[PDB]
Write the structure tokens for this entry.
Amino acid sequence: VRFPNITNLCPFGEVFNATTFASVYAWNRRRISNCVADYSVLYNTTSFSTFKCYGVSPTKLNDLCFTNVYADSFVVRGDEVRQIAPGQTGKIADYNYKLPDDFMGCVIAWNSISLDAGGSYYYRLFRKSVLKPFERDISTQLYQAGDKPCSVEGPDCYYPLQSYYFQSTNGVGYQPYRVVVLSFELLNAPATVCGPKKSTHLVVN
Amino acid sequence: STIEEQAKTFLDKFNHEAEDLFYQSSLASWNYNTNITEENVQNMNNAGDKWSAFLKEQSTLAQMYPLQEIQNLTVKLQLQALQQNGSSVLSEDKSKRLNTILNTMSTIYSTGKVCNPDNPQECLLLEPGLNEIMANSLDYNERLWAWESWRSEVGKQLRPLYEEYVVLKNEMARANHYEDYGDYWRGDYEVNGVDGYDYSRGQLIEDVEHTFEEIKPLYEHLHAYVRAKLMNAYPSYISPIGCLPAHLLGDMWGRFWTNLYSLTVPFGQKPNIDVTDAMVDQAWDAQRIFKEAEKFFVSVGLPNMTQGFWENSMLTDPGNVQKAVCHPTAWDLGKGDFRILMCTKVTMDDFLTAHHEMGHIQYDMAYAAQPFLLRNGANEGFHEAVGEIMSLSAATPKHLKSIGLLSPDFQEDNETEINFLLKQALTIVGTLPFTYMLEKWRWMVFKGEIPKDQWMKKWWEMKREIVGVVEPVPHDETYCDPASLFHVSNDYSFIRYYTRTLYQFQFQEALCQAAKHEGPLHKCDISNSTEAGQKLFNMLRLGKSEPWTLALENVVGAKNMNVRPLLNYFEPLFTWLKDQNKNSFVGWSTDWSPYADQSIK
Ligand SMILES: *[C@@H]1O[C@H](CO)[C@@H](O)[C@H](O)[C@H]1NC(C)=O
Ligand SMILES: *[C@@H]1O[C@H](CO)[C@@H](O)[C@H](O)[C@H]1NC(C)=O
Ligand SMILES: *[C@@H]1O[C@H](CO)[C@@H](O)[C@H](O)[C@H]1NC(C)=O
Ligand SMILES: *[C@@H]1O[C@H](CO)[C@@H](O)[C@H](O)[C@H]1NC(C)=O
Ligand SMILES: *[C@@H]1O[C@H](CO)[C@@H](O)[C@H](O)[C@H]1NC(C)=O
Ligand SMILES: [Zn+2]
């Protein structure tokens, strides 16, 4: 006989192992729900250059349950991965992707020069105000730096979105890195995502 | 919207748009400097013109933000360097003519060869051989050939080009509000706007001529000692009262008296301070030369070399399949790309230049986090000194034992301290009068003090007086012996190497005080002190953001270069040379010439 599909495995393969990734200014957000998140496949990985988790322990994820789990993915430069953390500043954190100050979840990154060489990846260089936590600005409106209004890109009128140029001869800091931001939230509510050890815990109705 | 705030957004758009444009220009120049081809001189010029055209638009846009409104010196230093209409001041034809002159000069130097009249295909070029004759040969007439042929075949090609290169570079600097092209070069040491730490362009001329007067006594007693030991090598050739013939020194020009060590070592029976023969016995590959230099920087806590450095650098001579500019250069291509172009040999000199050019890269890697325009050394002397601070500690007998190049049971003696200090003076002291005279000539040529009909007359008049070196063959104004050096043909300042030398002994004092050293300044070492490297790194990471005057005070304690740490480094050799020169004449005569006739009429 065949063991039943009482619970399903979370689509971490569709997220981490995706063929293409989003730009930081337009980061892709995927909801994870009604599945068992096996973090052991993420642990058995040598390519992950970053694996930092906040509010929780990276060794206790397979034994925890959460009411709402999100998966955010984008491609950022190597020296900008540090900005994908609570309380950080910079062009990426201020104008592209800002983690909340009281952020519970994990931030995983790995080098992708083998796949994202060349590539169409953009970042926002200018913005009137700093991005609020988990906000997305996909606007293409010119940035008015001076007092003179902007009718076309010119002296004091800059186009907001600027392009990345990824080459193999670049340093590690300027090389492309794929970031996956797992965002966790636990409330006094039924659980939607659980670890393998807590598989029966509230994942069943 | 303050002018300062909208200028930071302008510099932000510049610092990000310039990263890839400068990178592709460096990717093209690297392929040419390693693969000299006409295909790669078009690709270099096409990428360089893209970068120069980009700089012209940014220079014009930067002029809209007045420097008086910005109160942030980091922004003002950025806007100032971006504003200056470097070559834009020249006409379209004059800018293309100067770039053709600048290119024709660089190629003639790296492609010029002297051919056999008997066999036209028998050619010898400076990097493969003419340099070897001038480094290892002991024949007066063979050395005279490589010396005269390089200046009568390549220098003569450079004479009418240099005359145009002077008037074009002088028209450029004057339209940029400089007195001449020498003043434009001297502006690298300029500091203005920081009270108590400023420095004028004319102060460099004063301080160099004030510090050089205090090196004249030590140079004299070394020049008299070298004259004597050169007479034993070249009998009936050098006068006991005259100047050294130019073709009998260490290299093609006399830049470094390093190669004269075998002819000059005081106690030649002791173990060799020159560890060239040990590197062959203990077979050492180019890789080990740079891997061992990596350990020196790792030891002081400075970073190890990038993976792309080992993958993308050219550390060995490629071969006959392609030509490359074999002069040791360090490349900060941008975007974290750090490379070294060196046609490394197994000599001890290449072992010490590997430290010099890795010190370039370690400096380049440190200020990488700074804005693009501030990604540069505080001055040219600071950049060339960083590698010399390391090679100063890497050439000591104590360090040479730890890498196994010396005997495990090696003993240090008063004798070994002398013959080591002499080899140091052959490279460090022997180069100062050559560097001061070469810059003083160019400075006077750019100023117009030396007329065109007297370029070669004053060049050898000054080399006899300041350097104490006489020409073996009389040279007319059809020659351009200055241009026979890479730096004079490839538009590079030379006063770097004078200030470099004085800085490296100021930095070594402070760096060896951070580390625990209770001994003399020579035989010092900082090869495991993570405290001395941090004191060095805290200036390496600053770049050109803070002035070199203040950057020097925060490390060595002085806001100006001091020659006293140098004179104190050679005090054992100076008092020793004065004893050995009791039987010899200390000084030289500007009238004796090897080509003079010994007869009356
Ligand atoms: C991604 O795919 C590779 C094979 O293509 C596999 O070894 C790896 O485990 C996968 N990663 C995840 C998180 O599924
Ligand atoms: C030299 O340049 C040619 C292009 O003309 C290229 O095909 C070749 O690989 C280059 N060789 C080296 C050693 O860079
Ligand atoms: C210069 O401006 C930058 C903002 O672009 C600021 O971070 C820095 O602190 C300023 N420097 C000084 C010395 O005020
Ligand atoms: C650049 O040139 C223009 C005229 O060609 C001049 O008005 C401006 O002051 C120059 N800027 C600098 C920094 O020399
Ligand atoms: C540095 O320490 C190592 C031991 O870790 C030693 O082998 C080496 O000789 C030391 N070098 C110096 C210059 O002290
Ligand atoms: Zn150098």
Observations:
- The radius of gyration of chain B is 24 Å.
- The longest helix of chain B spans residues 3-34.
